[PDB]
């Protein structure tokens, strides 16, 4: 209890991620049976995650209300950050440092995955798990997770929108609701709200570096053909 109503409406938009887990792993079980590098596997997992993210956005209150051009602009401004945030929150939920949990729910030792990555993605994963640690020490919960997801989707820095005022209002509403919820449910940890907000630019920097890395790796022919991932990358 002690949850503002707007945050319950936002929680109503969360997918039955058990079923999403199952469907993604079924898709991959089927695809691999018809030589796939670990990097390509991660690319295809991120592709399915992107499909699910699009289904979550077009399920959102406020978001459906937007012209499809505005939806496109917001989604292509924030898809990478949403991916990184979902990864970080997954790690926070499972909270077994020294392991990485995939959108499949599959746990794999951080060692064996990092061994296969270059310096760029290794640095980005290290930073992501530092963020995981800090958010765990703050007791990042699901309510704050969805509030952050909506703050990232409805970004103030997306220009050339027709209904920028809708995005401004959504930002104001979600910011106020998260303030109220965090400080009322965690008097334990005053300034937890400002800290949560301070973590967003860092997630964003990680997201942008990763986005450009995968873009350049695609231009070099090392990103296996992932339809929506590559489509988001090119634009």
């Amino acid at each position: 209890a002690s949850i503002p109503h707007l945050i319950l409406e936002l929680l109503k938009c969360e997918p039955d991620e058990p079923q999403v887990q199952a469907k993604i792993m079924a898709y991959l079980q089927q695809e691999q049976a018809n030589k796939l590098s670990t990097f390509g596997l991660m690319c295809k997992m991120a592709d399915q995650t992107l499909f699910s993210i699009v289904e979550w956005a077009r399920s959102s209150i406020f978001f459906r209300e937007l012209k499809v051009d505005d939806q496109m602009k917001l989604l292509q401004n924030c898809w990478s950050e949403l991916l990184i945030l979902d990864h970080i929150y997954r790690q926070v939920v499972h909270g077994k440092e020294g392991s990485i949990f995939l959108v499949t729910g599959q746990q794999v030792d951080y060692s064996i995955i990092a061994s296969q990555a270059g310096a760029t993605l290794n640095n980005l994963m290290s930073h992501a798990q530092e963020l995981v640690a800090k958010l765990r020490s703050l007791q990042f919960d699901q309510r704050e997770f969805v509030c952050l997801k909506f703050l990232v989707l409805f970004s103030l820095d997306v220009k050339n929108l027709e209904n920028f005022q809708l995005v401004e209002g959504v930002q104001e509403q979600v910011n106020a609701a998260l303030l109220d919820y965090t400080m009322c449910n965690y008097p334990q940890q005053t300034e937890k709200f400002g800290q949560l907000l301070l973590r967003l630019p860092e997630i964003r920097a990680i997201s942008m570096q990763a986005e450009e890395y995968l873009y350049y790796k695609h231009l070099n022919g090392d990103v296996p053909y992932n339809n929506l991932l590559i489509e988001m990358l090119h634009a």
Partner: peptide, 10 residues
């Protein structure tokens, strides 16, 4: 990005 548009209109 025609794929994203088809996803959002479907």
């Amino acid at each position: 990005n025609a794929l994203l548009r088809y996803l959002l209109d479907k």
